[PDB]
Design a protein around this ligand. Structure first.
Ligand SMILES: *[C@@H]1O[C@H](CO)[C@@H](O[C@@H]2O[C@H](CO)[C@@H](O[C@@H]3O[C@H](CO[C@H]4O[C@H](CO)[C@@H](O)[C@H](O)[C@@H]4O)[C@@H](O)[C@H](O)[C@@H]3O)[C@H](O)[C@H]2NC(C)=O)[C@H](O)[C@H]1NC(C)=O
Ligand SMILES: *[C@@H]1O[C@H](CO)[C@@H](O[C@@H]2O[C@H](CO)[C@@H](O)[C@H](O)[C@H]2NC(C)=O)[C@H](O)[C@H]1NC(C)=O
Ligand SMILES: *[C@@H]1O[C@H](CO)[C@@H](O)[C@H](O)[C@H]1NC(C)=O
Ligand SMILES: *[C@@H]1O[C@H](CO)[C@@H](O)[C@H](O)[C@H]1NC(C)=O
Ligand SMILES: *[C@@H]1O[C@H](CO)[C@@H](O)[C@H](O)[C@H]1NC(C)=O
Ligand SMILES: *[C@@H]1O[C@H](CO)[C@@H](O)[C@H](O)[C@H]1NC(C)=O
Lengths: 170, 318, 318, 171, 319, 168
């Protein structure tokens, strides 16, 4: 488990219907929402990766027990014991498979949320601080285009550092 | 002035299982266990034979109901539930191994045995039990040999099938067990009856077991069948004295086919690789819970209705 | 001023295995492979039957040892090491299939054949090898037919049993194989002995054969037991000349039960779903190492003494 | 693996019989110890879950195909033998893998719950504290016994001490 | 001034599968599936016996081809593709069960039955079909009993073998099935023929049956072989009047051994624990793809040519 | 996954050969490249634990190679054997897929643990650039660098300077 989804993030956003992860922002001009393309694709590709292995297909079997006539009692019992054995094995494997896969899927989605959050933190550098709920409190005015540069990963921290520091400190 | 990170969620999530948690809600999930089948035998791209009320055993000995299934080629052979193997009472020794060889084959040819019989033998006998086109008849592939001159001893007779081909041939014959001492004497004579069958590798002996008293008791007239494989270059000889139901043809099983037992109707427009008593299974899922009895290329049977694979993150609604 | 985070630990940790480490120390763990069983057949809640020194086969033919076990009903049938099938020495065809059919059964009813014999036949043969109430006796469900007039030809005889029930019946008979010419002559006369049995689904002939053999339970002569399933509405006839060991009752297997071979005493106050030679297994663990032979609903057998599942973090001692 | 339990935390604390994870502070009043209930129940809850999966086996009914007390026909005995041994090799390999995989994940899970408590407190402390290499937080203002509990209580308000804290961090 | 962190890479990495990616490049990887194997039978450390053209059944009845194999001790017994069982043609009831019993044993001793016959029996009949020194012979462990005086009724005869030992013995006999009424009459007389065999634990009985068949080693006649185990302290009695091919020795199977069917040549300098039709498999790898039919202690067979287990980090080379 | 390998670190160093993990640095006297022995060994050891588990019953024949098998028991044997083979083959594939998934993420992990070790080490004298580097805000000569690699660096020594630098 990584720290984010069902972690320090309080809940999910039903509203955000265009991606798996993304950004909400607050500035003098208002409020906006946007999805992050790269992080949602990275998660989605890994899911489809799993699905591809799942549907991977096989060996031809022929009948070893007659549907419409009697089999000799003793070899009948052997076949019965053997099939039920094989079936318990696949049953158990099929339970294991989805339990393990599901755990990892969940934790993987968490990790891509974290890696997004981590990327942003490192960009903002000394210009923001974390509020512990997944938001970065930014210490300069940040207009729509400035928000854009953050989600777009072109935000230059040095451009705001001076202002930022004396706002963090006074 | 603030930028917040987060993830999506849905109003209705799906519940899946993990190592640490049953009832774990996620945004989306798909089924790994196929639970629904096609109730028809999809035979597109398959050279198949539906045997109708003809049992595979019937094919080799030529019971009336298999007259249209005495030969053929196929990659798939379909057997139906109450198919007819026999027109006269009796049974086949080692029947399940023979049925599987047939159901494993890719087709059948017939080769004449060449058997001829002397003047003192009647080979053209027939029976009310085996009707063909409203007349007394018999297994197409066999001959009921009796003494032409009733009450008289069946002559010591010899017959030899020679496999002059490059593959093993399957020869069947029958032994007649009369319903009484009276019946036996009339067909074959008072003499002790012995039916001997010998190849390079196979040997066996048969003595007709003579029934008693009324026809409705358990010891009444029957013809039981025996078979063996004759190798290329090898001969098989019948030395008999009365009681032998002789092959006028033997069979040649050819190539491999898939054997299906099912009462599902043939659908020629769909294609499939997996079959069970109930029809076909076409699916990409690796498991199925339709039947533990399948043939072909199949998903593995599991004892579970549903096994959901998560295709999304934990669903955390507000 | 300072604030510090940490986890707990204990003095004595427990080693577990991981994908990366053979010897990995954790805080707690529990066994996943069961190693202990109960030395009892926990039969509470089962209508069970302990055959004691009665062998399943002896139930059908009625050896003295099985007098308490000739009819009954059960979901669980227990077989034992000392178990006797035969008092009069002999053997049975397909004996293990028959034994298995009896051990899956849920009970046995017994139905008279109605067989009567005329004044030429003494139907009350008995022997010292089959003691019953301090007296000489015989299989309870069979009858040793011999010539009433010693040395005379056993008459040609026909007996027919009709199953008028709605389920199949299992009928058993025997063929006597005397140990000397003198014995065969006294019992059946000097004629050639022939016994034939026929139903819709069985036909066979048997010939008593004289032979010197070691004494078993005092006798050098033997009985060969044969059996077959008679279907509802069908008839099975015996045509015999001497040597037939005739059925006076036939059997009916009813429903389903679980067959157990064990050494362990019964405990009708404990419950269990899993059984082996040594008793019962009541565990929640998925695996066991008690025995690779078990019947019922069991953990799977594994070739390992121990397999520890970590129930806590890594242990890092001070 | 997360960097904590066998990592930047030198060693476990035997003294904490109170729970799985927790706090040790040092302030003018004295030193003390407490265990965080959320984090421990998080870990334990996942454990008891693996254990529920382990015992949640409903089972097929097998009957006997091997006689204990009489001999089985030789060829059929050898098929049976080979089948049962081939099944047992599968279950043995499955049981080994199950535990090895499960154990690896159980450790790393416990490591994670620890790292997640640490991060919760690091963020909650904001600019009033700095981390040493070990699992400790050097707090740059006087912290009360009431203040300390306020950090585990998750009620600590960082704006209340910031000015003071910022000044000590720079001077 | 700055310090930077990094991981290595390699120019040429190798592709593996993961749960999420079938084309995942990593720094190093290694095979889990054995592919090579050895086209010889590695028999170093084993007391073995190569049977050559002797079939295991022939050891017990004593076919000529098996003369160097009538007794012995071994832990590995090797059978070859066209080994010979029968000089005088016929077959053995429950032959494959018998063959597996022999092929699981760790050896065989022989034990004389001590059988003897009255004056009117010729017990040393021979045939062109079984040859020693380029001359007529018979199975070494059996005797063809016939009327010394041709066409005469073969005497009613009793022969008892007694197992006075502490382990079970394997006794084999044959039943002669002549090719013609005339031939049967010459050998055994015109009387009806009956052979009955009986112990405490076994009863069966046999009828010589005349019939025309194809020639196998020039004979249309056949011997059907039968066998049973005689327990410690039990006796087995043959009652016969023509047609018995009587055992002159019985066999005792000793201990346990691994049986191999393969025509790969034996190699005495290399050892193995896993064998198939091609010779051997020596590998630490848990999986193999050489053959679904192996004996010994083998890796498990799998339907894949290759499964790479990554042994390094992800490979991220410079752009 | 952890954010480092194939993550916020653009790529690997083909020129590092004495380890899986290590340090590059730039200062007055030039540049350098040293591999980290500790982190390299926690990864490698973990790998050899899997190769260990990898390399750790006697069976006889039940299928005559050279003679005919009775047909019905023959098909039962074929079926059972093909079913065992399907099982082992599925097990083989899952083992490797699952194991490879874990090995990669463990490798990624150990790198992040080293990055995290250094970060807490340097404390308030440095700022991360996001591409895996710490901009050291004071003069730091070759013996200062090894001090960072040795985990012997005392932040308090260079602190007051570095802080005057970060703030102006
Ligand atoms: C297996 O074959 C064995 C050989 O035939 C059977 O053993 C034989 O059984 C008979 C009758 O049950 C015994 O016969 C009697 O002998 C006594 C005298 O016995 C003592 O003297 C003999 C001769 O020197 C000596 O060998 C014994 O050990 C005794 O010291 C007479 O008084 C009787 O009239 C009668 O002739 C045989 O002695 C006995 N043989 C052995 C070696 O025990 C055995 O019964 C067969 N097994 C089965 C299962 O039938
Ligand atoms: C099957 O029978 C035929 C004749 O009954 C045998 O074939 C003869 O074989 C000899 C030598 O092989 C040839 O000289 C003859 O020309 C063959 N006859 C004909 C007309 O082809 C054959 O050998 C028998 N097969 C077996 C296995 O006994
Ligand atoms: C069995 O016998 C009864 C009475 O004779 C008769 O009704 C019935 O037809 C017989 N069964 C068969 C199948 O012949
Ligand atoms: C040890 O494990 C068992 C089962 O996991 C549990 O009942 C018990 O509480 C554990 N004991 C300790 C020391 O926690
Ligand atoms: C079958 O295997 C079991 C297990 O070792 C052994 O007791 C028995 O002797 C073997 N049976 C056969 C058919 O040889
Ligand atoms: C068993 O399978 C093998 C492999 O295809 C094949 O050669 C053989 O015919 C099959 N045996 C039977 C009993 O059909």
């Amino acid at each position: 488990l990584f720290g984010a989804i069902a972690g320090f993030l309080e809940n999910g956003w039903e509203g955000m219907v265009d991606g798996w992860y993304g950004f909400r922002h607050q500035n003098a001009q208002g409020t906006g929402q946007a999805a992050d393309y790269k992080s949602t694709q990275a998660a989605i590709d890994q899911i489809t990766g799993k699905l591809n292995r799942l549907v991977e297909k096989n060996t031809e079997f022929e009948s070893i027990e007659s549907e419409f006539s009697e089999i000799e009692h003793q070899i009948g019992n052997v076949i019965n014991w053997t099939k039920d054995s094989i079936t318990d094995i696949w049953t158990y494997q099929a339970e294991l498979l989805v339990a393990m896969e599901n755990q990892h899927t969940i934790d993987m989605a968490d990790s891509e949320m974290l890696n997004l959050y981590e990327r942003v933190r490192k960009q903002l550098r000394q210009n923001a601080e974390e509020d512990g709920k997944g938001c970065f409190e930014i210490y300069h005015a940040c207009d729509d285009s400035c928000m854009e540069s953050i989600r777009n990963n072109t935000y230059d921290h040095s451009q705001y550092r001076e202002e930022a520091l004396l706002n963090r400190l006074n | 002035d603030k930028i917040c990170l987060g993830h999506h969620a849905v109003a209705n999530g799906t519940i899946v299982k993990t190592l640490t948690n049953e009832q774990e809600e996620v945004t989306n999930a798909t089924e790994t266990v196929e639970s629904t089948g096609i109730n028809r035998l999809c035979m597109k791209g398959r050279k198949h034979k539906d045997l109708g009320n003809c049992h595979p055993i019937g094919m080799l000995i030529g019971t009336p109901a298999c007259d249209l299934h005495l030969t053929g080629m196929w990659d798939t052979l379909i057997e139906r539930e109450n198919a007819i193997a026999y027109c006269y009472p009796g049974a086949t020794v080692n029947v399940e191994a023979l049925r599987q060889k047939i159901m494993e084959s890719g087709g059948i040819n017939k080769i004449s045995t060449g058997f001829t019989y002397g003047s003192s033998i009647n080979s053209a006998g027939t029976t009310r039990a085996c009707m063909r086109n409203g007349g007394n008849s018999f297994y197409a592939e066999l001959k009921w040999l009796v003494s032409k001159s009733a009450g008289q001893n069946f002559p010591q007779t010899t017959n030899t099938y020679r496999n002059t081909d490059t593959a093993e041939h399957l020869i069947m014959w029958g032994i007649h067990h009369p319903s009484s001492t009276q019946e036996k004497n009339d067909l074959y004579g008072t003499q002790s009856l012995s039916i001997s069958v010998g190849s390079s590798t196979y040997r066996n002996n048969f003595v007709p077991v003579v029934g008693a008293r009324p026809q409705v008791n358990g010891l009444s007239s029957r013809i039981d069948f025996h078979w063996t494989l004759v190798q290329p270059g090898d001969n098989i000889t019948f030395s008999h004295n009365g009681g032998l139901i002789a092959p006028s043809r033997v069979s040649k099983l050819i190539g491999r086919g898939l054997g299906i037992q099912s009462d599902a109707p043939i659908d020629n427009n769909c294609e499939s690789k997996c079959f069970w008593r109930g029809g076909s299974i076409n699916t990409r899922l690796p498991f199925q819970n339709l039947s533990p009895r399948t043939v072909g290329q199949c998903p593995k049977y599991v004892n579970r209705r549903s096994l959901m694979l998560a295709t999304g993150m934990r669903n955390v609604p507000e």
